[PDB]
Amino acid sequence: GSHMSTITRPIIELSNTADKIAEGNLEAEVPHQNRADEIGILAKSIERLRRSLKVAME
Amino acid sequence: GSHMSTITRPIIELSNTADKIAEGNLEAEVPHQNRADEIGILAKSIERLRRSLKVAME
C-alpha cells in the first residue's frame, strides 16, 4: 500500500522525540500533540511522561 | 480477515501502558519490547522514560 508510507512517518517522529527526552532533554517539544486520532493519543502520552520527568527533577 | 486490523491493537496497548506509567505506575511493564520493527522501537523508548522516572525518584 503506497498510502502506508505516509502513515509510517509520524511513527518515526514520535520515536525520535521520545529518545531525545529519555536521554535528559526535558525541553524537547513532542510533535503531533494536537492530533485527535490514534497517533494524536500516542503523542499526548509522550508529553505526559515529559511532564513527570521535569517535575521529578524540579 | 483484514491484516491492517492487527496493526491498531499494539498502538492501543502502547498508549495505555504509557498512561499507566505517567499516572504514577513506576513498575508498569511496557509491551512489545521484543519487536525490532517501528513498533518495537516505540516500545523501547517508553521503557527508557519509565526507567528515568524510577531513577528520578531514587
Q: How many CB atoms lie within 10 A of CB B45?
A: 23
Contact B49 A15 (CB under 8 A): no
Residue A32 marked as a ligand binder: yes
Q: Which sign, positive or negative, has the C-alpha torsion B14, B18, B19, B21?
A: positive
| Closest-approach residue (CA) in chain A for B17 | A45
Q: How determined?
A: NMR
| B45 Cβ neighbours under 8 A, 6+ residues apart | A15, A18, A19, A22
Nearest Cβ partner of A49 from B22, B41, B57? B22
| Grid coordinates given for A30 | 513532542
Q: B27 near B17, Cβ under 8 Å?
A: no
Q: Classify burial at A1, counting beta carbons within 10 Å of its beta carbon; exposed 0-12, middle 13-18, buried 19 or more.
A: exposed
The distance in angstroms from the start CA to the end CA of chain B is 47
Decide: helix, strand or coil at residue B46: helix
User: Which CATH architecture is the domain A1-58 placed in?
Assistant: Orthogonal Bundle (1.10)
Share of chain A residues as helix, strand and coil, in percent rounded to the nearest 5: 70, 0, 30
Domain boundaries defined on chain A: 1-58
Distance from CA of A34 to the nearest CA of B (A): 16
Annotated binding site of B for Zn(2+): 13, 32
